[PDB]
Amino acid sequence: DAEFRHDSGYEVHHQKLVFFAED
Ligand SMILES: [Cu+2]
């Protein structure tokens, strides 16, 4: 996501924590 821990570009692609991407 863009909010929980890192970055901006995606509601998925959660590379900082990898486990949740619930879109
Ligand atoms: Cu993310």
PDB file of C-alpha atoms and ligand atoms in Angstrom:
ATOM      1  CA  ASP A   1       0.000   0.000   0.000  1.00  0.00           C
ATOM      2  CA  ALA A   2       0.858   3.754   0.161  1.00  0.00           C
ATOM      3  CA  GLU A   3      -0.045   4.426   3.888  1.00  0.00           C
ATOM      4  CA  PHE A   4       0.773   1.731   6.524  1.00  0.00           C
ATOM      5  CA  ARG A   5       4.667   1.885   6.414  1.00  0.00           C
ATOM      6  CA  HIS A   6       6.180   3.161   3.045  1.00  0.00           C
ATOM      7  CA  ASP A   7       5.883   4.744  -0.431  1.00  0.00           C
ATOM      8  CA  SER A   8       2.901   6.127  -2.460  1.00  0.00           C
ATOM      9  CA  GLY A   9       2.504   4.650  -5.985  1.00  0.00           C
ATOM     10  CA  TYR A  10       0.287   1.588  -5.156  1.00  0.00           C
ATOM     11  CA  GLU A  11      -2.650   0.229  -3.101  1.00  0.00           C
ATOM     12  CA  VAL A  12      -0.664  -3.116  -3.439  1.00  0.00           C
ATOM     13  CA  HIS A  13       3.152  -3.875  -4.018  1.00  0.00           C
ATOM     14  CA  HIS A  14       3.828  -3.761  -0.240  1.00  0.00           C
ATOM     15  CA  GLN A  15       7.603  -4.342  -0.472  1.00  0.00           C
ATOM     16  CA  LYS A  16       8.432  -2.846   3.044  1.00  0.00           C
ATOM     17  CA  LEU A  17       6.362  -5.635   4.828  1.00  0.00           C
ATOM     18  CA  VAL A  18       5.043  -7.973   2.002  1.00  0.00           C
ATOM     19  CA  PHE A  19       2.255  -9.729   4.021  1.00  0.00           C
ATOM     20  CA  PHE A  20      -0.871  -7.563   3.485  1.00  0.00           C
ATOM     21  CA  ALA A  21      -2.039  -6.170   0.084  1.00  0.00           C
ATOM     22  CA  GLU A  22      -5.799  -6.627   0.561  1.00  0.00           C
ATOM     23  CA  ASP A  23      -7.102  -4.645  -2.505  1.00  0.00           C
TER      24      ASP A  23
HETATM   25 CU    CU B   1       2.596  -0.753   0.789  1.00  0.00          CU
END
